[PDB]
Design a protein around this ligand. Structure first.
Ligand code: NAP
Length: 303
C-alpha cells in the first residue's frame, strides 16, 4: 500500500517469532524479508506455516533488511542487536531485565549512532506499552504510588529455571498478583522417574529465585496440559494532580502475551524507520510514530 515496503526480518522462531510473522503480514507498510534461525533448528522439519518463506541462518542471505525483530532469549539479545546494528540494520527487542535497561540502552545507543541505525529496546508488554501507560500516570499525578500487578500468567524465565533443577522432568511456573505490586509464585512440576516430591520441593523453595518470595509447589501428571499464554496486567495509581489529592487511575489488559508483544515490536519497527540514529525505549518516541497513516488523519481520528 506504501511505495517501498519496510523489509522486516524475524530473528529466532519461538513463541514471539511465530506471532511476529502474523503481525508483519497484517502490517500494510511491511513485507517479510525472512526468518533467521540457528543452524541446529534449520535441520528440523520445516514448519508448515513457513512454506514460501526464506528461512536462513544469517541475515545476509535475505537481501535488503530494514528492521530486524529480535525474538531471541533475553540474555542472547543485546549481543545479537549490537551485531545487527553494526550492519546498519534497525533492531527491535523486548528485553525484559529492568535493572539492565539503562546500561543496555547506552551500549546500543553507541553502536546505533556509529552505523546510522535505530535500536528500540524493551518494546514489549512489560517493559513496553505498560511502561508508557505507567509514565503517563506519573506526570498526571506526580505525588503518589503506582502499583503494577502482573495477573495470573506464565513466566518462561522461571519455568526454565525450575526445569534445570535436579529431579524435575518438566515444570510450569506462574506469576500471581497478591496486590500492591506484590506477587506470589506457583510452580507445577512433573517429576523424573523415581524422584521424590519432598526433596525437589525443598530445592525449588530454596532456589535463589523463590526464597524471599512466597512460593507454592504442586506435582502434576502433565504440565503441558496446564499451559496457556494469556496474561493480565492491572496498574493502579492514586496520586496528587498539582495539589489536589485522591486522583484515581486504573489500567487493565487481558491479552495473548506473545501476540501482543509481537504486535508492539512490529509497531516499534514502524517507529524505528522514523527516528534519528540511536537507541530508544518506548517512552522516548512520539506515540504517533508507532501508528500507520497520514499524520493529520490520525490526529483527527484520535486526538
Ligand atoms: N517485554 C515483554 O513484555 C516480554 C514478554 C514476552 C517475551 N519477552 C522476551 O521475548 C523473548 C522470547 O520469548 P519467547 O516466548 O519467544 O521464547 P522462546 O519460545 O523460547 O523462543 C526463543 C527462540 O530464540 C531462538 N534461540 C534460542 N536460543 C538461542 C541462542 N542460544 N542463540 C540464538 N538464538 C536462540 C530460538 O529460535 P530458533 O530455533 O529459530 O533459532 C528460539 O525459538 C524472551 O527472552 C523475553 O525476554 C518479553
Amino acid at each position: 500500500r506504501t511505495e517501498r515496503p519496510i523489509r522486516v526480518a524475524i530473528i529466532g522462531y519461538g513463541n514471539i517469532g511465530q506471532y511476529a510473522l502474523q503481525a508483519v503480514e497484517e502490517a500494510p507498510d511491511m513485507e517479510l524479508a525472512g526468518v533467521v534461525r540457528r543452524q541446529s533448528s534449520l535441520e528440523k522439519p520445516l514448519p508448515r506455516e513457513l512454506h514460501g518463506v526464506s528461512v536462513v541462518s544469517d541475515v545476509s542471505a535475505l537481501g535488503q533488511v530494514d528492521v530486524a525483530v529480535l525474538c531471541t532469549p533475553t540474555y542472547e539479545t543485546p549481543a545479537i542487536a549490537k551485531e545487527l546494528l553494526a550492519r546498519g540494520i534497525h533492531t527491535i527487542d523486548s528485553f525484559d531485565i529492568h535493572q539492565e535497561i539503562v546500561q543496555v540502552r547506552h551500549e546500543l545507543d553507541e553502536v546505533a549512532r556509529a552505523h546510522q541505525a535505530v535500536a528500540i529496546l524493551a518494546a514489549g508488554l512489560l517493559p513496553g506499552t505498560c511502561s508508557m501507560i505507567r509514565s503517563i500516570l506519573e506526570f498526571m499525578a506526580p505525588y503518589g504510588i503506582t502499583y503494577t500487578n502482573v495477573g495470573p500468567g506464565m513466566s518462561m524465565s522461571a519455568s526454565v529455571a525450575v526445569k534445570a533443577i535436579e529431579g524435575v522432568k518438566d515444570a510450569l511456573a506462574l506469576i500471581i498478583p497478591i496486590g500492591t505490586g506484590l506477587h506470589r509464585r506457583m510452580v507445577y512440576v512433573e517429576l523424573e522417574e523415581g524422584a521424590d516430591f519432598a526433596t525437589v520441593k525443598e530445592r525449588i523453595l530454596q532456589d535463589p529465585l523463590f526464597v524471599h518470595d512466597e512460593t507454592h509447589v504442586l506435582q502434576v501428571d502433565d504440565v503441558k496440559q496446564l499451559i496457556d499464554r494469556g496474561i493480565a496486567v492491572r496498574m493502579e495509581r492514586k496520586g496528587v494532580s498539582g495539589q489536589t489529592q485522591n486522583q484515581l487511575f486504573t489500567y487493565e489488559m487481558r491479552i495473548n502475551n506473545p501476540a501482543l508483544t509481537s504486535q508492539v515490536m512490529i509497531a516499534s519497527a514502524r517507529a524505528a524507520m522514523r527516528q534519528k540514529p540511536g537507541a530508544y525505549t518506548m517512552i522516548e518516541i512520539p506515540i504517533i510514530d508507532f501508528l500507520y497513516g497520514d499524520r493529520d488523519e490520525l490526529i483527527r481520528r484520535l486526538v
